[PDB]
Amino acid sequence: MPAYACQRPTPLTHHNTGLSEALEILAEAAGFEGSEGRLLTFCRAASVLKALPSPVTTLSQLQGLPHFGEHSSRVVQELLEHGVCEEVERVRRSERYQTMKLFTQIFGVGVKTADRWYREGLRTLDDLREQPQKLTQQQKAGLQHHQDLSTPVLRSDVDALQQVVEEAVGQALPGATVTLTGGFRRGKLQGHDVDFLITHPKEGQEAGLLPRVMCRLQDQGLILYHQHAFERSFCIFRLPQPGSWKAVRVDLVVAPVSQFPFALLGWTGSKLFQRELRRFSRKEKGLWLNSHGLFDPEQKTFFQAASEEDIFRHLGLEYLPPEQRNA
DNA sequence: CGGCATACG
DNA sequence: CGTA
C-alpha cells in the first residue's frame, strides 16, 4: 500500500464501506473544529480502506497500512468487535456536529460562518430565516433553495442539462465544447452538483467566454442564481421535473485548450485525490501542480500537456482513469 | 518537530 | 469571507 492516494487505484464501490464511513465522520468533525491535519489523516485512513481488495476482518490486517496509528486503529477495532465505535456515535449525536453539518451544507456558508452562528446560539434553518438582514445574497439564495439542493442530482438528469448548456455555449462561441467533469465523470450515479468544463480548440478564443455563456443562460430563464471578467461560475439552475422543476447546483468553468488537461484533472477529483496529487507533485517531484498547469521551479518552465495521460507521465505515476480516482 | 493543495469569486 |  503506497502512502499517497494518487499512487493507487480507488474504485467508487469497495469492500470496507462501513469502516471508511466511520473514519470520514471523524474527519468531518475534525474539520468543524478547524483541525485540518486530523481531517487529512482520517480521510487518508478511510481512503486506504477504499483501496483494499477485500474486507478488513481482523485488526492485524491494519499492520503496516499507512495512516493507521493508535487512533484510527482503535476506531476500526471497536467496529470489528461491537459493530459500533462509541467516539463516532458520540460525534453523530453531538449538537455541535449536527448543527455545523446543517449550517455548512448551506450554499454560501463555510465552517467559519457556521461556527460563529453556533457560538451566537443559532441551531436551525428557521433561526437563520428569522434574521435575514444578517445574510449575504449568496446565503439567502442557498437558504431559500436548501431543500432542493439537499436532493441528489441523478446521472439521468445530466444529459438534458448538458444539452441546454451546449446550446448556450455554441451561441456564445461556435466550436466551443462542454465536458462533464466531477463525480459523474468518476462513474457516480448521483451527486450534489453538476460540473462542466468549457474550452475551444483555438487557443485564446475562450477569453471572455463565461460571461457570454451566463448572459445567454439567464436570458433563457434557466438561472435561479449566479454571482453576476470571470472563469468559474457557481450557479443554481432550473432543472425540469414532471409538471414542475427543481433547483440544482451547476458549476461552469472555462479553460484555454493548453490548460484543459490540468483543469479536467482537477475538476474530475476526488477532492482528496487532487490534494494528494498536488502534495505528491511538490514533495516527491519538486513540481508545483494546480488546475492551470505544472511548474518546474528550478527550470522556471511549465510542462505542456495534451492529455491527463501526459500529466501522470510527467509526475512518474501510473495512469489512473477517472473511475479509479475515488479516493 | 513541520507539514498538511492550491486556486478563483 | 465564500466557492471548486
Added chain:
DNA sequence: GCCG
C-alpha cells in the same frame, strides 16, 4: 493524526 499521522509520515518522514
